[PDB]
Amino acid sequence: ASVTQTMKGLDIQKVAGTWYSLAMAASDISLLDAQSAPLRVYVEELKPTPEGDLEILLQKWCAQKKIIAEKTKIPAVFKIDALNENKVLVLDTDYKKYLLFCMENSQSLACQCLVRTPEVDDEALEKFDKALKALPMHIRLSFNPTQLE
Amino acid sequence: ASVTQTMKGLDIQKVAGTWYSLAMAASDISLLDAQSAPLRVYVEELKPTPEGDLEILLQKWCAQKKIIAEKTKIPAVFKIDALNENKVLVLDTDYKKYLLFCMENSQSLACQCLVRTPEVDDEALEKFDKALKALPMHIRLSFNPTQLE
Numbered sequence: 001a002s003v004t005q006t007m008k009g010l011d012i013q014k015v016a017g018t019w020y021s022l023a024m025a026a027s028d029i030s031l032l033d034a035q036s037a038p039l040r041v042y043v044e045e046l047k048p049t050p051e052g053d054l055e056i057l058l059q060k061w062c063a064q065k066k067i068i069a070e071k072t073k074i075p076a077v078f079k080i081d082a083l084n085e086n087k088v089l090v091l092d093t094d095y096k097k098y099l100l101f102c103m104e105n106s107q108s109l110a111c112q113c114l115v116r117t118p119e120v121d122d123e124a125l126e127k128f129d130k131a132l133k134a135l136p137m138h139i140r141l142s143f144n145p146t147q148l149e
Numbered sequence: 150a151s152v153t154q155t156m157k158g159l160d161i162q163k164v165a166g167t168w169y170s171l172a173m174a175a176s177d178i179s180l181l182d183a184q185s186a187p188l189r190v191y192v193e194e195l196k197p198t199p200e201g202d203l204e205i206l207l208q209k210w211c212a213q214k215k216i217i218a219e220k221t222k223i224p225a226v227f228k229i230d231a232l233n234e235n236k237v238l239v240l241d242t243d244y245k246k247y248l249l250f251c252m253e254n255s256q257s258l259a260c261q262c263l264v265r266t267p268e269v270d271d272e273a274l275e276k277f278d279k280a281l282k283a284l285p286m287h288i289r290l291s292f293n294p295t296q297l298e
């Protein structure tokens with residue numbers, strides 16, 4: 001992906017709190033085509049620190065995971081400093097309703113559409129679809145309302 | 150789905166021969182979100198009979214399967230008479246390049262875009278995307294050129 005695509009003027013503090021993963025897309029099928037695929041994870045909560053890092057509460061196959069994404073020089077880009085280099089890229093958010101982001105396997109690329117509340121609305125899903133057009137995506141997933149919880 | 154969506158004036162004889170599954174979509178994630186999901190099958194060959202039925206050579210997880218789809222009153226709609234009622238619905242084809250079809254769990258619905266040859270072209274993928282707009286699809290899959298074989 002390009003920095004052109006990442007978010008401008010992100011305030012990390014305002015993304016705090018509860019989120020729900022409404023849809024996912026990935027550049028290769030293997031990343032999402034099974035409950036136990038490595039990036040088939042559901043964001044539960046986001047928690048900025050006072051130091052500007054991003055704590056991420058995930059659900060996997062479900063287990064609770066916690067990962068820390070440290071800030072980098074580029075804003076809206078965060079580094080999950082595990083053994084295998086993974087970046088978190090925030091593409092866009094209005095903070096109060098939706099948040100789009102991707103994960104890069106520093107090649108592969110999985111993105112998500114996050115919503116604050118399962119409120120009936122499709123701004124997120126529209127804006128997400130409109131951002132994925134510019135990226136190569138080979139698998140694409142949307143969760144119905146019984147899938148949320 | 151509706152009969153409005155199925156193909157008009159299908160000649161079953163002209164779909165004979167080799168095909169490749171370039172993309173799949175389904176109404177529920179579970180139908181395709183794993184190599185061993187029940188409708189994660191790849192058409193290898195189609196073989197009309199002189200009696201107007203449709204033999205279907207599939208690849209699964211890969212194993213070779215063979216299933217017979219018998220003709221019904223509605224043309225372009227075929228019945229896979231197994232224990233669990235499954236219909237095959239041909240939505241459209243020009244015979245010489247693409248073929249779109251769905252499978253119904255008489256509720257659930259998985260469709261595919263089939264091409265004659267991995268020839269670089271995107272009529273099939275365009276016409277497929279344009280037919281899926283009218284159907285509820287929650288998982289969506291496209292195969293790159295190393296995935297074909």
